[PDB]
Design a protein around this nucleic acid. Structure first.
Ligand code: CTP
Length: 580
DNA sequence: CCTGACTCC
DNA sequence: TGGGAGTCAGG
């Protein structure tokens, strides 16, 4: 553990070589407008630490950072790029990102620092970030000599690990997935995060004030029905009211006590009117806590924008996640919640929000991968796929499919994608479990290609130890041969689902790259704001809507070619709510 | 820090 | 006994 480096007082020419490992260290977990605490550069000429005050005000270093022909290898380049944007500096030329490389090789390792990636290649000459900075309230930037050594060791690690990681990605046929998909996407995500989304705070606050009144009213109605005050947001207390005081039946337990999940409570609605009120209260309360108060807490006051962070190296299937705030779970299903979307507005006057979503992409991907003739033909003629499944299960003509039938069929269609059991299906639909079991049997009789896919993908996972997606993403399933039924069954359902969910993730990621390319080449002001798994949200001048109406669905539908068409719906309006 | 609730795909 | 996520208040 001995590594020479230079603690530089000024930028020199030899630090500005055309290939380098670069560390631009941002310790705060939310890197938006966060301090850069230090810089390290490792290249052919040596190893260098620079203070940000020095490096970031030096016009040659700033020029080097922005020169796309000066190639940098980094870990979590999006963090660095966004933090630099907040400092008014452009980062270009990032040719290798070790975080994204590690994520593709095995998402289950949970790699979130250089040391963790380094462990995948038995490289030990660098410490974990948590050991250097500490945890929680103890977290602190260490004295310069200690900080400098750490950043330089991180850079040296990236320098030495690039080739071993690329070589393994190449053997896995994942190098193009890194270089042509994830790395270009990282730049697009950086742009989206830094742009942010504008919030109508006057409207949100008015909503909040009216919501608080309604919440108080339901709260009092609940105490009156219970005949007593209690904390409705406490599982223990509520459980005592429902199952001991009011003596309602106990339908389900958790390891800590009585379940009061919405699924459970809905089944108790007929017994006592306190239960519907409790469900309503908890709905309103989550709107208040999360989508009014929580959201206002993260609005940047001077610009009224929120700036999410899209975690690109977290989910086990290749999806993104969205944090602080999560803009991928804004309410839409109930009108009361959906109104929250009225607060999300374009960032300029006379601009509009444009929202485009894939129609049933998971089931279309299933049709493709399973090569199920019945499912394929249905999508080829754009027959509503819930109606189709109802026809086959109930053995009725399309005209005989009743609203309840299509509802049962829709539950089956998605259930299948998750490996649902007859129990889960019966619980979800509130039908006899015998009936549910018959639905699943009939489904697999009607879609034999899907049945074979479910059988075969489990066999593949057991033989290989992992499953793949269309663009060669992997998920390892080391528990798939467990002798324990619960453990094994969960892994089997992951095997069934991951190629579907993950291939859908691959597709929309490629679509984002293709769409950005078309937007930039056409010099449109339109730009991406958000991705929500199977949908993309943009804003643009109202004059550009006619163009987007053609461009956005076409690019999304053509991103990949499957054995069935892809179909995209789209809407636009003056707020996100109105983009429907 | 975990649990269980609500929110989305 | 339904796949993937994040935030919240209370435990
Ligand atoms: N060396 C390779 C080859 C293929 N792929 C991935 O697998 C997809 C399709 O592979 P192909 O062999 O061309 O069929 C590519 O688009 C890419 O995402 C890759 O990442 N690296």
């Amino acid at each position: 553990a001995k590594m020479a480096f230079t603690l530089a007082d000024r930028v020199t020419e030899e630090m500005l070589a055309d290939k380098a490992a670069l560390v631009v260290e941002v310790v705060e977990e939310n890197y938006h407008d966060a301090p850069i605490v230090g810089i390290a550069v490792v290249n052919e000429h040596g190893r260098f630490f620079l203070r940000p005050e020095t490096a970031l005000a030096d016009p040659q270093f700033v020029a080097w950072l922005g020169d796309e022909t000066k190639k940098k290898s980094m870990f979590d380049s999006k963090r660095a790029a966004v933090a630099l944007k907040w400092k008014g500096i452009e980062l270009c030329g990032v040719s290798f990102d070790l975080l994204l490389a590690a994520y593709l090789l095995d998402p289950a390792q949970g790699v979130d620092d250089v040391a963790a990636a380094a462990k995948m290649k038995q490289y030990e000459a660098v410490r974990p970030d948590e050991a250097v900075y500490g945890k929680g309230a103890k977290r602190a930037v260490p004295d310069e000599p200690v900080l400098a050594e750490h950043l330089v060791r991180k850079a040296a690690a990236i320098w030495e690990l690039e080739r071993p990681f690329l070589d393994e990605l190449r053997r896995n046929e994942q190098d193009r997935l890194l270089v042509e998909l994830e790395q270009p996407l990282s730049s697009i995500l950086a742009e989206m995060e830094f742009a942010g989304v504008k919030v109508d705070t006057k409207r949100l606050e008015q909503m909040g004030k009216e919501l608080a009144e309604q919440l108080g009213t339901v709260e009092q109605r609940i105490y009156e029905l219970a005949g007593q005050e209690f904390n409705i947001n406490s599982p223990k207390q509520l459980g005592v009211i429902l199952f001991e005081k009011l003596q309602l039946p106990v339908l389900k337990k958790t390891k800590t006590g009585y379940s009061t999940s919405a699924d459970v409570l809905e089944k108790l609605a007929p017994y006592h009117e306190i239960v519907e009120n409790i469900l309503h209260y908890r709905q309103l309360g989550k709107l208040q806590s999360t989508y009014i108060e929580g959201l206002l807490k993260v609005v940047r006051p001077a610009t009224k924008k929120v700036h999410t962070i899209f975690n690109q190296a977290l989910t086990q299937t290749g999806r993104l996640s969205s944090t602080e705030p999560n803009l991928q779970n804004i309410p839409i299903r109930l009108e009361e919640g959906r109104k929250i979307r009225q607060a999300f507005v374009p960032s300029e006057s006379d601009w509009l929000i444009f929202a485009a979503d894939y129609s049933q992409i998971a089931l279309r991907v299933l049709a493709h991968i399973a090569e199920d003739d019945n499912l394929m033909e249905a999508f080829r003629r754009d027959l509503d796929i819930h109606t189709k499944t109802a026809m086959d299960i109930f053995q009725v003509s399309e005209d005989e499919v009743t609203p309840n039938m299509r509802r049962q069929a829709k539950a089956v269609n998605f259930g299948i994608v998750y490996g649902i059991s007859d129990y889960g299906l019966a619980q979800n639909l509130n039908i006899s479990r015998k009936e549910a079991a018959e639905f699943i049997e009939r489904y697999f009789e009607s879609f034999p290609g899907v049945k074979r896919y479910m059988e075969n993908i489990v066999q593949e996972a057991k033989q290989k130890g992992y499953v793949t997606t269309l663009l060669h993403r992997r998920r390892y399933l080391p528990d798939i041969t467990s002798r324990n039924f619960n453990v094994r069954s969960f892994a089997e359902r992951m095997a069934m689902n991951t190629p579907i969910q993950g291939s859908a993730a691959d597709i929309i990621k490629k679509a984002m790259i293709d769409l950005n390319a078309r937007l930039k080449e056409e010099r449109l002001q339109a730009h991406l704001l958000l991705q929500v798994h199977d949908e993309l949200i943009l804003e643009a001048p109202k004059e550009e809507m006619e163009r987007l109406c053609r461009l956005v669905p076409e690019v999304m539908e053509q991103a990949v070619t499957l054995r069935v068409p892809l179909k995209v719906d789209y809407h636009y309006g003056s707020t996100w709510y109105d983009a429907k």
